[model samples]
Target: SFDKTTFRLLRGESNLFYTLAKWENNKLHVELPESPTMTLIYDENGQLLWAQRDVPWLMKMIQPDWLKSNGFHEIEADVNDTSLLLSGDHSIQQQLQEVREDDDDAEMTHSVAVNVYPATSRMPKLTIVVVDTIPVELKS
Candidate 1:
């Protein structure tokens, strides 16, 4: 139901928040209200499981496929009890690589597609969606 433009906006916002919060202290520090709060969980394999967002804009940016490739295939938003979940399979990596290649073309701007996988006991159970190019305004 979400539009591509909306998804791009959300992805941009989340990326900005992440850049602002990632610090040398190894802890994510973000401004309350101004920034979205994110929590990263790691699985037994030392892979990111899920990230919870307090900010709506930031939450929208979350792509389940991206997290899964990075090894965060199992994710739960907010609380662990929430039925809402995201999971991914290894095939996603191939798809991601293809998209990345497409982004390499100079004529086109880069974009990302991701799928969200609802909670399931099966392996690689997730949905896929795309986040397209987000234009950045440069000021001289």
Candidate 2:
């Protein structure tokens, strides 16, 4: 009778059909409360971390822990360069973007310093953490 609980914290095999599931190794391993056909995984703090077979994509607070762990890199979305503070200007910045694309100047010095703040919600913004990971640069 105890499936999805009033307490997600008190999560886990609450009850058959309406439950979270078994397998709690630091995270949660959920069972298909209704889909006795599919399965689940876990994370550090939440239950039902990942659903392998079924289930659609959701936001972070509700999304599977596995999804939480990854970079969540959203390649193409609506990007407003103006709002984001960057070191370079328009043309220079564009050329400095995605070095992997049209790498004609195989021997140029292009450097970019960016600080990306997480969006207020959703995949509205992907994994554009303000880290110097990809390392951007300017063109001639």
Candidate 3:
């Protein structure tokens, strides 16, 4: 139920609490409530699983076949899970490629799209399992 305005009020409070805690004690930790729609989970090593919102949006715009074409593979995961999971090992250059669809034909076609980032920084080879909790609503 936290909209942008409501979320801001709590964020300010959290920030203030963090400042007070930091001033009082050198070693401190602060946590905020997770968004109901967008949940994030990190592995034991502190590496992130993909964001929840990305799954639904990607599923809408990027086809599963396109994922295969891009060399991402479906990794083994819990059968009861509700999200799409993928694994890929490559540079940031490869990871940043946008999923572009060819517009020349009536039939949907896929093409590799690209983007910018640090040339030296490589995307850590990892498995990301995004568990989507957001409800799908009809568009007008």
Best by lDDT: 1
Which numbered prediction scores highest in TM-score against the true structure?
A: 1
- Mind giving the per-residue lDDT tens digits that candidate 1 earns over 1-140? 23455455544544443344322343334432251123433332334434443234334445433645421222222221111121132333343344346554312122333433333332223222222222111000
Clashing pairs for predicted structure model 3, backbone only = none
lDDT of 1: 0.33
Model 2: per-residue Cα lDDT at residue 46: 38
Q: How close is candidate 1 to the true structure, as a TM-score?
A: 0.28
TM-score of 3: 0.19
Model 2, residue pairs in steric clash: 3-18, 49-64, 49-65, 110-137, 110-138, 111-137, 111-138, 112-136
Report the C-alpha lDDT of model 2 over 50-111, residue by residue, as the tens digit. Answer: 54333232223233322343222222211222112233344444644554355534333211
Q: How accurate locally is residue 129 in candidate 3, as Cα lDDT from 0 to 100?
A: 24
Better of 2 and 3 by lDDT: 2
User: How much does candidate 2 score in TM-score?
Assistant: 0.18
N/CA/C clash count, model 2: 8
Better lDDT candidate (1, 2): 1
The best-first sequence of candidates by TM-score reads: 1, 3, 2
For residue 9, give model 1's deviation from the true position in Å.
Answer: 2.6
Provide C-alpha RMSD values for all models, in order. 17.3, 18.3, 16.4
